[PDB]
């Protein structure tokens, strides 16, 4: 039997792949016309013939016998940008971004459009813009939101990028939505591989000391921060924080200096190399990391720290921000989830988002004197909260400044990029898991460094050192840490301390 | 079955007051009826369990149609008066006389998140934590209006016309907010809380923070308005709380082998796992995780308060444990120094839209009636928030001295 597995004690809705779908006939729940309006109700009414044979208890009109029609879809499988009236009232395997979400309710007794004739229905629409991270360098959308029916409502949450297939819910002008049909999380559900396996040999070269420069094309100095820039480029998206949590490896970095002290440029490079990465500068006035609970509409204009989930950001002019944006970042950095609760939008929406940060020498140019904790006035804890706080100090180094303008001009043209991006993907799903021996070497020298910089935090610093060794071995595509991978981090954190 | 069995329920209600001798040669429900016409008791509650023992109709049916079997419970009660009466709607038509509901666990106190499209028209009970105590008003329900050329009383629920109180049908009402218990949310979610519809003698009754009863249930006064449930313009079913009632009070080593060995040895080794030792602190946390609330009668009212401070924040990421504590601690809330105003702990007031004027809603402390109070950055609770603290020294300490409101709430 192919119809008796539907548990309608549970939610009547089902998941259906196309291979078993074509096997049925009309009125036995097939789909071969792709004429949904007849094909769906006929599917459901076929199911209503299947349930009445399985359980007449399950044969109830208030139960809709809906379905998502999930598997092997393709012919329609595009984005909101790309979801056009050729699919008008067609089931499109929508990939996109669940960012800009809606306000909630049940609906009313849909009578014109058993607890009484016409009960409410648990419902809202939810936005999908096209999947941005593969989207054009520049392009406007014609996107849409999408209906979440009862059992589907509140399934996923804003900021996801997902695999959701359903019916192009157009009205007649030309206004639409989808009704999901069902969600799968592409956000959960994920050729030069062997070439990378050839490239990535330790017999190949030290990629790490290289690659930090192989993507820092236009930067004299800062060779520490390149590796940092790499390291923050590197790192996983999960820590096995059972029944609790701590400092983590998605932690985020601060820098000091001007652009043309490479600030914007580095970010621009981090931006030009921002794969799973959105930026900002400072204030970023567009619901920075918020849903903003948007009036007389209501929308959830889920900000960066929603849009940056499973990502890393660039902040420029970090000092610019509001105190609230100085504040709420502080914890949601820690939580990694965006504690929002006004009249309406209550949540801690995840903030699986690292950052690189930059801002100004306050009222300096040099701004050397004092702890950034008041040298740069975004004062307190945030800084201790941050991964790292490097200063591209404006120290005149004429022997370099000699080189710098030459170093400008070997790039001037008197007359290996994606290679990272193809490296990094393969790296981002590895786990260079523990080694006692490295761990010894880490555990060896933390206390040393902790003691060495005596003349700086056990609950924290180890955890970045952990991640710092990780990026090393992650870039190696190694599956456990090398004692040298555990080493340069100590050098790195030492290079934080020089 | 519903719209046309009017005679039964009237027959039923004609007999159910007669169905026993428990109201002194009358049923208990009829005990009130003579007390009703004599204006002794005016509001009524209903233990629906007594009906299902002989007729689960009007029990399962009201559970299927609260409104109708609410409304139909009334229209019998409407014409049932002359049978016990000591003497459109005639003037007295249950005009100050009211009906509530209660009974078996078929209406278990449900979750603020678990209101539904199914919960429309539903028989509806809830427990949880209270806040948003509005300024009560009286509230008319019927525009006993004037046909001036014609004289005697005329009633609309709704131009040259006047709408005049002398026969109109009023009520004392409020807004309230039930909240989750902070106990059935071992979750990465917000403890939800609800706009509550609040009325009757169950206004002017209770304070925030309480764990309570409800019945969030429709009034008999109208089914839908002029017709069945299908309509074109409709305001919201929110929680029409009937029978709001406090919850004063809802693994043995003798049968098992559990409390025998010292928790004050053992519980350390099974609490604070990530923590890097220093269980010594944990003891007081263990002590506070015990608390001292439930006192013996020696007047030790300060027993409840284990009032600890810990000094310095990236102490092991001691920032973390308060979540661990709250992961342990129900009736518990966390706050931070400069995260919000004192109403992170305290309460304050302004207008609202739905119902109720200037709902006082309160903070963690107002939320923490005998709770567990967990702070970040006690130093940034600058002088304002240094203060009710310095009162909350004294237990039931959220005191007000403002123009319209001058209470204290039970911190």
């Amino acid at each position: 039997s192919k119809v008796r597995e539907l548990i309608s004690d549970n939610q009547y809705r089902l998941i259906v792949n196309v291979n078993d779908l074509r096997r049925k006939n009309e009125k036995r729940a097939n789909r071969l016309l792709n004429n949904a309006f007849e094909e769906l109700v006929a599917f459901q009414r076929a199911l209503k013939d299947f349930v009445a044979s399985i359980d007449a208890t399950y044969a109830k009109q208030y139960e809709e016998f809906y379905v998502g029609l999930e598997g092997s879809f393709g012919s329609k499988h595009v984005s909101p940008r790309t979801l056009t009236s050729c699919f008008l009232s067609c089931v499109v395997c929508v990939e996109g971004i669940v960012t800009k979400c809606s306000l909630v309710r049940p609906k009313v007794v849909r009578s014109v459009h058993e607890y009484g004739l016409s009960v409410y229905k648990d419902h809202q629409t939810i936005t999908i813009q096209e999947m941005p991270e593969k989207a054009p360098a520049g392009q406007l959308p014609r996107s849409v939101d999408v209906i979440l029916d009862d059992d589907l409502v509140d399934k996923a949450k804003p900021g996801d990028r997902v695999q959701v297939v359903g019916t192009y819910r157009c009205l007649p002008t030309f206004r639409t939505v989808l009704i999901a049909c069902n969600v799968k999380q592409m956000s959960k559900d994920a050729e030069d591989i062997a070439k990378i396996k050839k490239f990535s040999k330790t017999r190949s070269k030290d990629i790490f000391d290289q690659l930090a420069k192989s993507l820092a094309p236009s930067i004299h100095g800062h060779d520490y921060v390149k590796k940092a820039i790499l390291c923050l480029l590197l790192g996983g998206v999960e820590r096995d924080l059972e029944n609790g949590s701590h400092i983590r490896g998605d932690i985020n970095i601060l820098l000091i200096g001007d652009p043309s002290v490479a600030k914007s440029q580095l970010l621009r490079y981090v931006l030009c190399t921002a794969p799973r990465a959105i930026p900002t500068t400072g204030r970023g006035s567009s619901g920075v990391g918020l849903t903003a609970a948007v009036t007389t509409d209501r929308r959830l204009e889920a900000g960066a720290m929603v849009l940056a989930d499973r990502g890393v950001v660039c902040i420029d002019e970090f000092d610019k921000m509001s105190d609230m944006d100085r504040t709420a970042i502080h914890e949601v950095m820690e939580q990694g989830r965006v504690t929002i609760a006004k009249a309406g939008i209550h949540a801690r929406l995840n903030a699986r988002c690292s950052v690189l940060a930059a801002a100004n020498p306050v009222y300096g140019r040099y701004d050397q004197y004092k702890t950034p904790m008041e040298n740069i006035g975004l004062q307190d804890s945030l800084l201790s909260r941050f991964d790292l706080l490097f200063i591209m100090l404006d120290q005149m180094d004429p022997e370099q400044d000699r080189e710098i303008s030459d170093h400008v001009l070997r790039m001037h043209r008197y007359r290996s990029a994606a290679f990272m991006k193809k490296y990094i993907h393969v790296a981002k799903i590895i786990k260079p898991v523990l080694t006692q021996e490295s761990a010894t070497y880490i555990a060896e020298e933390y206390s040393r460094l902790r003691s060495q910089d005596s003349m700086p935090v056990t609950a924290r610093t180890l955890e970045t050192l952990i991640r710092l060794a990780t990026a090393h071995a992650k870039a190696r595509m190694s599956k456990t840490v090398d004692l040298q991978d555990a080493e340069e981090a100590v050098e790195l954190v030492q290079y934080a301390y020089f | 079955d519903y719209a046309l069995e009017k005679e039964k329920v009237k027959k039923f209600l004609q007999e159910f007051y007669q169905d026993d001798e428990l109201g002194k040669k009358q049923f208990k429900y009829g005990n009130q009826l003579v007390r009703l016409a004599h204006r002794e008791q005016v509001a009524l509650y209903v233990d629906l369990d007594d009906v299902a023992e002989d007729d689960p109709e009007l029990v399962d049916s009201i559970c299927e149609n609260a409104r109708r079997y609410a409304k139909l419970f009334a229209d019998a009660v409407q014409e049932l008066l002359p049978q016990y009466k000591e003497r459109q709607y005639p003037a007295e038509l249950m005009r100050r006389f009211e009906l509530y509901f209660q009974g078996p666990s078929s209406n278990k106190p449900r979750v603020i998140r678990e209101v539904r499209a199914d919960s429309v028209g539903k028989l509806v009970t809830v427990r949880g934590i209270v806040t948003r105590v509005s300024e009560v008003k009286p509230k008319m329900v019927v525009a006993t209006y004037t046909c001036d050329q014609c004289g005697a009383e005329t009633y609309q629920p709704i131009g040259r016309l006047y709408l005049q109180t002398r026969g109109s049908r009023f009520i004392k009402f409020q807004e309230m907010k039930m909240q989750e218990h902070s106990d059935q949310v071992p979750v990465g979610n917000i403890p939800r809380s609800i706009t509550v519809l609040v009325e009757g003698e169950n206004t002017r009754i209770a304070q925030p923070g309480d764990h309570v009863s409800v019945t969030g249930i429709f009034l008999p006064i109208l089914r839908t308005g002029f017709r069945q449930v299908v309509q074109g313009l409709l305001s919201e079913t929110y929680l029409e709380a009937h029978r709001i009632v406090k919850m004063n009070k809802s693994t043995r080593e003798e049968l098992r082998q559990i409390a025998e060995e010292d928790f004050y040895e053992k519980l350390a080794a099974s609490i604070a796992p990530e923590i890097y030792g220093h269980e010594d602190v944990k003891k007081a946390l263990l002590l506070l995780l015990v608390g001292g609330v439930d006192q013996s009668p020696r007047g030790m009212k300060i027993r409840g308060n284990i009032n600890i401070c810990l000094m310095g924040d990236p102490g092991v990421a001691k920032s973390q444990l308060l979540s661990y504590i709250d992961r342990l601690a129900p009736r518990s809330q966390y706050t931070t120094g400069r995260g919000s105003s004192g109403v992170g702990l305290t309460a304050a007031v302004l207008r609202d839209s739905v119902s109720g004027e200037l709902t006082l809603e309160g903070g963690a402390l107002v939320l923490a009636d005998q709770g567990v109070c967990c702070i970040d950055e006690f130093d940034k609770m600058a002088e304002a928030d240094r203060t009710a603290i310095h009162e909350v020294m004294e237990q039931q300490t959220i005191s007000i001295a403002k123009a319209g409101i001058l209470t204290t709430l039970n911190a």
Partner: protein, 426 residues
């Protein structure tokens, strides 16, 4: 062809309806399988001001911005070089370039000569890795009015084939950059644009640039830096080319003297007939010039001489554009140190303009003297009054804005407290 052309001009709307139907008739007679996969039509479909509304919907919705290389795809209801080559041969052409452009009503030669560089500008550098770079130096014209700077900007304007005079503190809803708004009907787009927008590639006579709207100010800072701005809305990937050039005209206000951005005067240089339209274009169209390395030697040496002297770094950059103008004034492959040295003689003035001739270290001391060491809560020490104490302490409104009302930028505790204590108390 013959049976359509003149008809389609006055009567487009039907004789082409025959065509696509005739195409559907042929496409059906092409006798492929014929499901409703019409989306590849727009593949086999191949096989405002320069306002007007134009067909911007289902296939046509949201392709590009306006004023572009006008490929009108639908219908709505040499010997002069030889002169220029002689001018390119011509030695003191620079000065008639300086001065034939010039109403000598006013103007230092250098000041114009920026313009004489400006119109030639830098270049647009499709460089080494993804990232590209400017090619065009910008000018910030402050000082006293009573100059016919209007006429001057209009000189540039009615010199500029690409370039529009802009206003003021805005006008209508086009920005100095890609402002937009809401169609009442569904708010699809209002590509309002901006001042660089109609002038992208040209030059923008920003009148009272200081007096602009703050809406673009948060945006302009970057596309001025970047020659492109991003539409920061919900899911709009588009970032628009702001590759127009500058004529940033405002008054000497009051990089210290910006509304809220005293570095953005970084973004400019230091300012206190149709013959050309034939001339400058071709070299604006051609050149693709560079810089002589031997000048790069002197440059590197010079900047070391200047480093004995970001300013320098971006001055490095600005020079690298300025002398880059000259090769385009000279049709050269690259630029000689004379250009640099002249450009230094151009810029050193601008640096002497950048000079004007002390730190804020006097300020936060005396303010922290005042903010808590005098009085934390600030009562009696308020901006109703202490303004006078600032008038005594010579800390003007701009300066207290430079410090005091950005001491709250520092997270200054008792000050930002005071910002709310004396929000009403004073």
């Amino acid at each position: 062809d013959e049976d359509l052309a003149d008809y389609l001009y006055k009567q487009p709307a039907e004789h082409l309806q025959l065509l696509e139907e005739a195409a559907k008739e042929v496409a059906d007679e092409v006798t492929r399988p014929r499901p409703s996969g019409e989306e590849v039509l727009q593949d086999i479909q191949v096989m405002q001001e320069l306002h007007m509304q134009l067909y911007c919907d289902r296939y046509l919705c949201d392709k590009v911005v306006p004023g572009n290389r006008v490929t009108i795809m639908g219908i709505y209801s040499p010997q002069e070089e030889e002169e220029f080559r002689r001018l390119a041969a011509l030695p003191n052409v620079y000065e008639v370039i300086s001065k034939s452009i010039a109403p000598s009503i006013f103007g230092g030669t250098d000041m114009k000569k920026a313009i004489a560089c400006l119109l030639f500008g830098g270049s647009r550098k499709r460089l080494p890795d993804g990232l590209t770079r400017r090619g065009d130096i910008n000018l910030l014209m402050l000082g006293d009015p009573g100059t016919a700077k209007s006429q001057l900007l209009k000189f540039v304007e009615k010199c500029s084939p690409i370039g529009v005079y802009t206003s003021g503190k805005g006008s209508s809803a086009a920005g100095l950059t890609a402002s937009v708004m809401r169609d009442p009907s569904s708010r699809n787009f209002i590509m309002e644009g901006g001042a660089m927008v109609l002038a992208d590639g040209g030059v923008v006579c920003i009148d009272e640039f200081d007096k602009m709207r703050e809406d673009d100010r948060v945006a302009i800072h970057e596309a001025m830096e970047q020659q492109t701005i991003s539409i920061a809305k919900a899911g709009i990937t588009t970032t628009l080319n702001s590759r127009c050039s500058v004529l940033a005209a405002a008054n000497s206000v009051f990089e210290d003297n910006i509304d809220f951005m005293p570095t953005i005067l970084s973004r400019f240089d230091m300012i206190f007939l149709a013959k050309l339209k034939k001339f400058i274009a071709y070299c604006r169209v051609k050149c693709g010039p560079r810089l002589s390395a031997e000048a790069a030697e002197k440059l590197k040496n010079r900047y070391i001489i200047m480093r004995s002297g970001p300013i320098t770094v971006r001055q490095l950059e600005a020079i690298v554009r300025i002398a880059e103008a000259l090769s385009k004034m000279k049709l050269q492959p690259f630029a000689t140190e004379a250009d640099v040295e002249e450009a230094l003689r151009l810029f050193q003035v601008s640096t002497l303009d950048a000079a004007l001739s002390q730190e804020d270290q006097e300020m936060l001391s005396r303010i922290e003297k005042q903010l808590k060491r005098r009085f934390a809560i600030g009562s009696q020490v308020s901006e109703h009054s202490i303004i006078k104490d600032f008038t005594k302490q010579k800390y003007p409104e701009h300066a207290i804005h430079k410090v005091l009302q950005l001491m709250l930028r520092r997270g200054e505790i008792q000050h930002r407290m005071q910002r709310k204590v004396l929000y009403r108390l004073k």
